[PDB]
Design a protein around this nucleic acid. Structure first.
Ligand SMILES: Nc1nc2c(ncn2[C@@H]2O[C@H](COP(=O)(O)OP(=O)(O)CP(=O)(O)O)[C@@H](O)[C@H]2O)c(=O)[nH]1
Ligand code: MET
Ligand SMILES: [Mg+2]
Lengths: 470, 134
RNA sequence: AGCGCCGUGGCGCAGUGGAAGCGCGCAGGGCUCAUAACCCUGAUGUCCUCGGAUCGAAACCGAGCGGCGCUACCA
């Protein structure tokens, strides 16, 4: 006669609950799979890429169970500018007796340490092999800065192709090439629509997809047929993620840094202001272990124009109120997972798209903002994302001096002007501030057909620095 | 290596043949009555059932398509206006095309739900969340 | 999530602090040999729910519902 809520509790405490992280653990001996890290935060970022209006939120929801929700009334239905986040817990059945393909199980973020096996007949429990974060990348032909930046966040890739539609989707290839630009190989190919094809059609589509993947850098990409709607064949996707995709090199040697992609003001309306909370930067950490209570500086931050038209850059100093990751407040932050760093910053900085693609450094490091950047570029033969009706996919021209182009430096979405063109080298002048820390893999897009179009990649070689005003 | 792709494709196809042997064909023929000044549609309840659709939402959608007024009588809709059975059949065809069955895949078991004030659709066979209200 | 609007008689506005309104609709009658035009009579309401001062509220207010526009995604 136990209520379902009582049953779920009883299982949760039976599954070990969610133990509180130690305040000060010995960080030298901590690995991303450690019990304190693995249970309460996501160590690998997996990103969804696909054609427009085929379903990339739904696949993530079928995997984990965490809704991207989708917002902004008009944007509820067409496309969403911001990224879609979700946490999945990867659980493997400890019983060898159960078949290997279905032992894997991806649960929501609130599951216990060892939940029971839903397979009828197995009393074995589930061990947590990893926790993963998901970065839903918009796949529209107009929205390109967010996709490049979300790529710049993630560490694993997930390609979706629909079966009944034409095989060569162009912006899917654009997504794949963008992934290849940032130095990722680990891509898993998904067939979203398989129930709606015949046996022969599905095999023909697989043959086409294989025929596409011969010249690209990625060679041994796994292909698996799934269904976001019917919600089957989830365990083998977890299998492929666990086997094919290891943890990128990420230890505690590298100095602390942050890369903010999203801004979230925390102002619960209707509530009295005497009970409020700071402003939260949704940022990803590729390097740096952050602990509850820290002073950090948003390097590009305040961007002002004086009476003389010169751009002044005031870094946003800030003290971390909390490091919101996964479900609960955590004492320490793990590199390789998106986290809401809530700080004392005024929420008007985190209301709209203001902190989208901005570098941050804790106090004890001095990254450099720049105004002119030397850049080393290399382009492809043709533009990706244009369905030419049978005629020679548009060839990339050579860049012209004084042309406004979108230069995605890591996460920063900036529109720069070319001041000189060389054989392989260029110089970009920026009006929207950009900093340089180490290399910041860069994506390049031009304006040839109204909306932005990817052309090629680049890395900064030099730049003219600016000294922030204290 | 795409070998371990065809096997799970086979597993999915066996899943499909197990769950859905039948793979709409359940639209009642809209036999109407045009009594000159009046029009009576008795099938409104049957088309409500065979499409798994609640009556009030269907009849208000019918009134939203065509600006004609009447009442609901008895398990039937009594609208005093002029329409051939072909045109009301066409309106029901539109409602069937865009509400009872999704355009992307063949399904029908979805029904009305209210997810922050509108009518947000969800499915049962799949688990869809689409914002169809107008 | 909060704020701006609303709670039909089939409709739209309304007086909203004496308790059922006006026009458009619809049924019926009148004029005409006859039709339209014109002229008269109408039955339709929980004027959305719950409580409260009030002889009394539909009106004046509030402890809930539903539908509308913005603040805009408000961890
Ligand atoms: N038939 C079928 N429909 C699907 C499948 N996956 C998703 N859909 C459909 O896609 C719709 C959701 O699309 P959505 O995830 O919003 O697309 P999107 O991710 O915003 C496209 P983009 O990433 O470019 O912005 C659902 O209503 C659902 O019916 C599938 O495997 N089969
Ligand atoms: C909004 S920042 C993304 C990760 C965070 N833990 C959530 O919320
Ligand atoms: Mg998304």
């Amino acid at each position: 006669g136990e209520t379902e809520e009582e049953k779920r509790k009883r299982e949760f405490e039976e599954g070990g609950g969610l133990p509180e992280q130690p305040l000060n653990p010995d960080f030298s001996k901590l690995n991303p799979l450690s019990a304190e890290i693995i249970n309460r935060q996501a160590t690998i970022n997996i990103g969804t890429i696909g054609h427009v209006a085929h379903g990339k939120s739904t696949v993530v929801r079928a995997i984990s169970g965490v809704q991207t929700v989708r917002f902004k009334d008009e944007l509820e239905r067409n496309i969403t500018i911001k990224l879609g986040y979700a946490n999945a817990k990867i659980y493997k059945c400890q019983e060898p007796t159960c078949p290997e393909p279905d032992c894997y199980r991806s649960f929501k973020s609130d599951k216990e340490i060892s939940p029971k096996c839903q397979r009828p007949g197995c009393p074995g429990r589930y061990k947590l092999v990893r926790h993963v974060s998901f970065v839903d990348c918009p796949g529209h032909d107009i929205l390109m800065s967010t996709m490049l930046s979300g790529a710049a966040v993630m560490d694993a890739a997930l390609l979706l192709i629909a079966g009944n539609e034409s095989c060569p989707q162009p912006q899917t290839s654009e997504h794949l090439a963008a992934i290849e630009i940032m130095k990722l190989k680990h891509v898993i190919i998904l067939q979203n629509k398989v129930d709606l094809m015949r046996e022969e059609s599905a095999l023909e589509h697989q043959k086409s997809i294989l025929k596409f993947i011969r010249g690209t850098i990625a060679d041994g990409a796994p292909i698996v047929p799934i269904s976001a709607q019917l919600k089957y064949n989830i365990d083998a996707v977890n299998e492929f993620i666990v086997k094919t995709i290891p943890v990128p090199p990420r230890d505690f040697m590298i100095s602390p840094r942050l890369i903010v992609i999203r801004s979230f003001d925390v102002n619960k309306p209707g509530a009295e202001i005497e009970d409020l909370k700071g402003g939260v930067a949704g940022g990803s950490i590729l390097n740096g272990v952050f602990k509850l209570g820290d002073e950090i500086e948003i390097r590009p931050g305040i961007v002002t124009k004086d009476d003389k038209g010169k751009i002044q850059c005031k870094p946003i100093f800030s003290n971390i109120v909390s490091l919101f990751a996964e479900q609960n407040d955590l004492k320490f932050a793990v590199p390789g997972g998106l986290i809401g760093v809530g700080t004392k910053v005024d929420p008007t900085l985190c209301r709209a798209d203001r902190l989208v693609g901005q570098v941050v450094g804790a106090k004890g490091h001095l990254p450099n903002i720049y105004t002119d950047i030397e850049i080393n570029y290399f382009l492809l033969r043709r533009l990706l994302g244009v369905k030419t009706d049978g005629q020679k996919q548009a060839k990339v021209r050579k860049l012209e001096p004084n042309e406004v182009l979108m230069v995605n430096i890591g996460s920063t979405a900036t529109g720069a002007r070319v001041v000189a063109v060389k054989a392989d080298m260029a110089r970009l002048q920026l009006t929207s501030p950009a900093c340089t820390e180490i290399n910041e893999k860069i994506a390049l897009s031009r304006r040839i057909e109204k909306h932005w179009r990817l052309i090629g990649w680049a890395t900064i070689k030099k730049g003219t620095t600016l000294e922030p005003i204290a | 290596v795409g070998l371990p792709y065809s096997e799970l494709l086979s597993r999915f196809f066996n899943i499909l043949r197990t769950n859905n042997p039948e793979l709409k064909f359940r639209i009642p023929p809209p036999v109407c009555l045009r009594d000159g000044k009046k029009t009576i549609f008795s099938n409104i309840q049957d088309i409500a059932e065979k499409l798994h659709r609640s009556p009030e939402h269907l009849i208000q959608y019918l009134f939203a398509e065509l600006g004609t007024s009447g009442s609901v009588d008895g398990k039937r809709l009594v609208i005093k206006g002029k329409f051939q059975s072909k045109q009301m059949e066409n309106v029901l065809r539109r409602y069937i095309l865009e509400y009872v069955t999704c355009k992307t895949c063949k399904s029908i078991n979805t029904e009305l739900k209210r997810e922050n004030r509108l009518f947000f659709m969800v499915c049962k066979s799949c688990g869809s969340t689409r914002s169809v209200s107008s």
